[PDB]
Amino acid sequence: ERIVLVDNKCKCARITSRIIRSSEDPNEDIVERNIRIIVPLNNRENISDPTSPLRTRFVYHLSDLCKETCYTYDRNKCYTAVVPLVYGGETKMVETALTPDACYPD
Amino acid sequence: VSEEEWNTGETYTCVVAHEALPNRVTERTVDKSTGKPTLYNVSLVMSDTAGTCY
Amino acid sequence: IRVFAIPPSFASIFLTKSTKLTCLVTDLTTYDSVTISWTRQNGEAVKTHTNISESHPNATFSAVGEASICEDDWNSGERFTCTVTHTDLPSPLKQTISRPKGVALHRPDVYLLPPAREQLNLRESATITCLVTGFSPADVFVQWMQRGQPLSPEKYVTSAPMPEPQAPGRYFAHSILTVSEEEWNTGETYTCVVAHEALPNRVTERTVDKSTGKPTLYNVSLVMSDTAGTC
Ligand SMILES: *[C@@H]1O[C@H](CO)[C@@H](O[C@@H]2O[C@H](CO)[C@@H](O)[C@H](O)[C@H]2NC(C)=O)[C@H](O)[C@H]1NC(C)=O
Ligand SMILES: *[C@@H]1O[C@H](CO)[C@@H](O)[C@H](O)[C@H]1NC(C)=O
Numbered sequence: 001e002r003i004v005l006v007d008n009k010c011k012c013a014r015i016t017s018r019i020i021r022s023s024e025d026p027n028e029d030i031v032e033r034n035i036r037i038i039v040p041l042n043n044r045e046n047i048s049d050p051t052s053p054l055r056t057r058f059v060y061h062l063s064d065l066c067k068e069t070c071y072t073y074d075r076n077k078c079y080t081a082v083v084p085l086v087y088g089g090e091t092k093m094v095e096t097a098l099t100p101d102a103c104y105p106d
Numbered sequence: 107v108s109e110e111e112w113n114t115g116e117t118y119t120c121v122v123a124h125e126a127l128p129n130r131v132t133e134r135t136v137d138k139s140t141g142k143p144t145l146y147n148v149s150l151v152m153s154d155t156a157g158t159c160y
Numbered sequence: 161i162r163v164f165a166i167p168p169s170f171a172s173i174f175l176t177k178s179t180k181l182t183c184l185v186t187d188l189t190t191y192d193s194v195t196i197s198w199t200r201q202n203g204e205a206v207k208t209h210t211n212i213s214e215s216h217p218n219a220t221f222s223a224v225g226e227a228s229i230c231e232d233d234w235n236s237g238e239r240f241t242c243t244v245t246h247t248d249l250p251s252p253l254k255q256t257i258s259r260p261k262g263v264a265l266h267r268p269d270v271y272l273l274p275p276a277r278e279q280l281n282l283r284e285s286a287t288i289t290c291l292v293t294g295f296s297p298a299d300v301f302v303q304w305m306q307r308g309q310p311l312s313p314e315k316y317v318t319s320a321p322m323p324e325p326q327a328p329g330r331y332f333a334h335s336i337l338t339v340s341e342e343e344w345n346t347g348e349t350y351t352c353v354v355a356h357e358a359l360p361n362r363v364t365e366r367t368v369d370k371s372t373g374k375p376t377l378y379n380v381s382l383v384m385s386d387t388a389g390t391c
């Protein structure tokens with residue numbers, strides 16, 4: 001019976017405007033919008049940049065996500081950044097894997 | 107429309123037709139799910155599990 | 161007069177995009193009589209010693225072998241033998257090195273731990289340990305960074321892989337970096353990288369600062385606006 005209005009994965013939100021029938025008598029049925037949000041509490045400010053500050057503030061204006069300052073890594077998407085590496089004095093760029101679990105070659 | 111028909115979840119669209127439109131026609135819909143809500147049990151979970159959504 | 165054949169470290173395989181074999185002999189008199197040929201499993205020898213570097217502070221002889229071989233050829237399991245004909249050695253010896261057969265591939269889960277609260281209370285130094293757990297093959301490569309600036313190789317010291325008690329196939333590695341507690345108290349981010357085969361693109365990184373390593377306080381300012389937001 002749930003109608004999942006929004007499932008934005010950056011600003012994790014699961015607004016479900018599920019209708020609930022009231023008791024045995026209809027015509028007073030209640031409508032409820034369950035904004036289930038999972039604040040990460042640990043993700044960095046610029047989530048793709050690990051060296052950025054920590055998120056001490058989480059704005060969830062529901063108007064924007066109904067229709068970006070990304071917070072939570074999406075399952076399918078891979079967030080990564082280049083890293084410097086030194087082995088014998090050579091500084092070689094290479095891509096990283098900030099979410100290795102979902103970033104296997106597929 | 108009937109009272110009991112609106113009581114159930116049947117959505118309607120009042121497609122209008124105007125000249126000054128990009129697609130030349132506008133469709134907007136509503137239903138009981140789009141109406142005034144009463145209850146909001148936002149769980150707003152707070153977890154140290156940060157990277158993965160849900 | 162000891163000569164050892166060094167198996168190809170994955171650091172050279174990936175970052176330099178080449179395979180180099182070094183069968184170096186040290187603590188021997190200089191006669192320049194070394195004839196090093198990296199004979200393969202087949203009769204053909206891929207390459208001989210090149211760029212011999214005798215110059216050292218101790219003035220002892222030092223001949224280093226080289227073998228530029230295909231990475232796929234390495235993965236095929238072909239073995240290579242280094243032979244030394246120096247008169248110091250009583251007889252020539254061949255050092256066969258082979259790519260291990262049937263090694264399982266498992267992701268190197270990288271966990272970065274902050275210095276203990278008590279250690280910071282010491283107000284003298286703080287040690288950050290990057291733990292690499294559950295990886296196969298045993299070979300692994302770890303480096304350290306701070307806000308995009310790699311640290312000196314001496315500042316961070318890593319441990320040789322040892323078997324994982326619960327998973328005999330897997331291994332674990334241990335790398336520790338030390339910094340002044342003021343640097344840690346500043347909140348400077350420290351990032352640890354792990355270069356290993358099992359990873360998708362062979363490199364993963366994790367970072368930690370004062371505010372995320374078992375922090376005492378969670379300062380949240382959660383704000384929601386336009387709760388209704390019908391659409
Ligand atoms: C900081 O956030 C910005 C977006 O707000 C991003 O910066 C760019 O992200 C793209 C995405 O692939 C990269 O190709 C660019 O290289 C990034 N910019 C620069 C200057 O490198 C990114 O999420 C964060 N920036 C960095 C450097 O990680
Ligand atoms: C919302 O209220 C109902 C009772 O009408 C209750 O059963 C439910 O647990 C509440 N939601 C919460 C606590 O998230």
Ligand SMILES: *[C@@H]1O[C@H](CO)[C@@H](O)[C@H](O)[C@H]1NC(C)=O
Pocket residue numbers: 020034036147149
């Ligand atoms: C919100 O309330 C409904 C009752 O209609 C309940 O079924 C639902 O589980 C509640 N939300 C959560 C997250 O439990």
Ligand SMILES: *[C@@H]1O[C@H](CO)[C@@H](O)[C@H](O)[C@H]1NC(C)=O
Pocket residue numbers: 377379380381
């Ligand atoms: C606690 O939170 C409030 C408001 O969110 C803020 O004003 C205050 O500075 C915070 N205190 C600490 C110690 O973070």
Ligand SMILES: *[C@@H]1O[C@H](CO)[C@@H](O)[C@H](O)[C@H]1NC(C)=O
Pocket residue numbers: 056057379380381
């Ligand atoms: C804590 O959060 C509040 C509200 O965002 C902010 O004003 C304050 O500066 C923060 N303090 C710290 C130490 O992060």
